[PDB]
Design a protein around this motif. Structure first.
Motif, short mmCIF file in Angstrom:
data_model
loop_
_atom_site.label_atom_id
_atom_site.label_comp_id
_atom_site.label_asym_id
_atom_site.label_seq_id
_atom_site.Cartn_x
_atom_site.Cartn_y
_atom_site.Cartn_z
N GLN A 74 0.81 -1.21 0.00
CA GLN A 74 0.00 0.00 0.00
C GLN A 74 0.85 1.27 0.00
O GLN A 74 0.31 2.36 -0.22
CB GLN A 74 -0.93 0.02 1.22
CG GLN A 74 -1.95 -1.12 1.27
CD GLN A 74 -2.80 -1.10 2.55
OE1 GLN A 74 -3.24 -0.03 3.01
NE2 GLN A 74 -3.03 -2.28 3.12
N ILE A 75 2.14 1.17 0.32
CA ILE A 75 2.95 2.36 0.51
C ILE A 75 4.18 2.38 -0.39
O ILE A 75 4.99 3.30 -0.27
CB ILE A 75 3.37 2.56 1.99
CG1 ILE A 75 4.31 1.45 2.44
CG2 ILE A 75 2.15 2.64 2.90
CD1 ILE A 75 4.92 1.71 3.77
N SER A 120 1.57 -7.02 -10.22
CA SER A 120 0.69 -6.66 -9.12
C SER A 120 1.18 -5.42 -8.41
O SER A 120 0.36 -4.64 -7.91
CB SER A 120 0.52 -7.80 -8.11
OG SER A 120 1.77 -8.05 -7.47
N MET A 121 2.50 -5.20 -8.34
CA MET A 121 2.99 -4.04 -7.61
C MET A 121 2.71 -2.76 -8.37
O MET A 121 2.23 -1.77 -7.77
CB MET A 121 4.50 -4.15 -7.31
CG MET A 121 4.80 -5.21 -6.23
SD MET A 121 6.57 -5.50 -5.96
CE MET A 121 7.00 -5.61 -7.67
N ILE A 122 2.99 -2.74 -9.67
CA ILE A 122 2.87 -1.50 -10.41
C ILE A 122 1.42 -1.21 -10.75
O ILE A 122 1.06 -0.04 -10.89
CB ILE A 122 3.73 -1.46 -11.69
CG1 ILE A 122 3.16 -2.34 -12.81
CG2 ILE A 122 5.25 -1.81 -11.39
CD1 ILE A 122 3.97 -2.30 -14.11
N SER A 164 -6.20 5.93 -12.59
CA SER A 164 -5.72 7.01 -11.72
C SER A 164 -5.08 6.48 -10.43
O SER A 164 -4.28 7.18 -9.83
CB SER A 164 -6.83 8.01 -11.38
OG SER A 164 -7.81 7.43 -10.53
N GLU A 165 -5.42 5.27 -9.98
CA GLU A 165 -4.88 4.76 -8.72
C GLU A 165 -3.50 4.12 -8.87
O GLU A 165 -2.84 3.86 -7.85
CB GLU A 165 -5.86 3.74 -8.11
CG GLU A 165 -7.30 4.34 -7.80
CD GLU A 165 -8.38 3.30 -7.39
OE1 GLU A 165 -9.49 3.75 -7.00
OE2 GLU A 165 -8.12 2.05 -7.47
N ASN A 166 -3.05 3.80 -10.09
CA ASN A 166 -1.71 3.20 -10.26
C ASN A 166 -0.82 3.95 -11.22
O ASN A 166 0.33 3.54 -11.40
CB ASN A 166 -1.81 1.74 -10.72
CG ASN A 166 -2.54 1.59 -12.05
OD1 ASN A 166 -2.65 2.52 -12.83
ND2 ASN A 166 -3.08 0.39 -12.29
N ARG A 167 -1.28 5.09 -11.76
CA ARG A 167 -0.56 5.80 -12.81
C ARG A 167 0.82 6.23 -12.37
O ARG A 167 1.76 6.26 -13.19
CB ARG A 167 -1.33 7.06 -13.22
CG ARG A 167 -0.83 7.74 -14.48
CD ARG A 167 -1.76 8.91 -14.91
NE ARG A 167 -3.17 8.55 -15.04
CZ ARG A 167 -3.73 7.95 -16.09
NH1 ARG A 167 -3.00 7.62 -17.16
NH2 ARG A 167 -5.04 7.66 -16.06
#
Ligand code: 9YE
Ligand code: NA
Length: 329
Positions: free
Chosen positions: A123-124, A221-223, A284-287
């Motif tokens: 999450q961080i 999954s991370m990006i 927008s949440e992973n850009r």
């Protein structure tokens, strides 16, 4: 089905003494587990319970992995692999091998790493963090592959990260195995979500490149922040989820290359899918975590054809890691 060999490090075990890879002939020396007081339960693995412990002889903090149930051949394998890999870059350090003096149950003792649970950690993570930790994980994989060893269980749960000290260790070598050219391996390894296509279609002559699929799944999954990235509900559904991204025609080409007869149940569920652009997963949440370099690397890891996936060393040279190798040299 057509044969296959590792792209790199294919003959390394045959170039070493037989004693190196003949783990059935390895005889561990079992100390007394009473030197270790169990302090905190940390978690578990398939055949183990893992505790934080203090070595009462020197006050050092360690981790004790209790093996239960107990297959002797598999214990010899894990122990020998860990000794072969000791001092390797970002490989968890095996410190001792002990037995409870009453139950005679075996335990492996490791260096302690103060892990941040990946569900909290992911999450961080920043873009730079993902490049850094992926690079450190690739060093461990290039190392163990250069030592003739496939991990075969690469997943977030098996990557310990002390995010305060920015330290990484690849753990749980209980599924790892020695690579030998043309050897047919058990495909019932890895977590479902990290199984490469070769395992899902029952292609047994696989190699180090299996870990590179698992690593691509983690990178995705991370990006993209979709974890796990390919979320199958069973082994058939796992291949369908992959095919809905990489495409079905590319899947059929892989199967034709290696003469793989497909389990006919797939005919009912695979359908036909075009390859999706990796950019289709951006929003927008992973850009802030995605870049052209990330996508180019991901594309060269998540390939059906295990032989065409990047090696760990090639992946380390990819431009996605330039920010990390620049601030590390
Ligand atoms: C401080 C916290 C919360 C965790 C530190 O977890 C560590 C640290 C150092 C070394 C190891 C582990 C660990 C190992 C192993 C496992 N765990 C953990 C994930 C329970 C579980 C699977 C089997 C295994 O082998 C292992 O070798
Ligand atoms: Na594990």
């Amino acid at each position: 089905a057509a044969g296959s060999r590792a792209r790199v490090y294919a003959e390394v075990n045959s170039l070493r003494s037989r004693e190196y890879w003949d783990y059935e002939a390895h005889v561990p020396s079992w100390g007394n587990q009473d030197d270790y007081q169990l302090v905190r339960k940390l978690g578990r693995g398939k055949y183990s319970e893992v505790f934080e412990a203090i070595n009462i002889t020197n006050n050092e903090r360690v981790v004790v992995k209790i093996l239960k149930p107990v297959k002797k051949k598999k214990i010899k394998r894990e122990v020998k692999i860990l000794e072969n890999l000791r001092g390797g870059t970002n490989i968890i350090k095996l410190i001792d091998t002990v037995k409870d003096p009453v139950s005679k149950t075996p335990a492996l003792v490791f260096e302690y790493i103060n892990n941040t649970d990946f569900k909290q950690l992911y999450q961080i993570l920043t873009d730079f963090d993902i490049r850094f930790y992926m690079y450190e994980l690739l060093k461990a994989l290039d190392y163990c592959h250069s030592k003739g060893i496939m991990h075969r269980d690469v997943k977030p749960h098996n990557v310990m990260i002390d995010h305060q000290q920015k330290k990484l260790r690849l753990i749980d070598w209980g599924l790892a195995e020695f690579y030998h050219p043309a050897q047919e391996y058990n495909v019932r390894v890895a977590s479902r979500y990290f199984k490469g296509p070769e395992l899902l279609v029952d292609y047994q002559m696989y190699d180090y490149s299996l870990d590179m699929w698992s690593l691509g799944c983690m990178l995705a999954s991370m990006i993209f922040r979709r974890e796990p990235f390919f979320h199958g509900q069973d082994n058939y559904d796992q291949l369908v989820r992959i095919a809905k991204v990489l495409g079905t025609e590319e899947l059929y080409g892989y199967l034709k290359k290696y003469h793989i007869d497909l389990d006919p149940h797939f005919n009912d569920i695979l359908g036909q899918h075009s390859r999706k652009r990796w950019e289709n997963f951006i929003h927008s949440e992973n850009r802030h975590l995605v870049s052209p370099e990330a996508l180019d690397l991901l594309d060269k890891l998540l390939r059906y054809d295990h032989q065409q996936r990047l090696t760990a060393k090639e992946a380390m040279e990819h431009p996605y890691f330039y920010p990390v190798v620049k601030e590390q040299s």
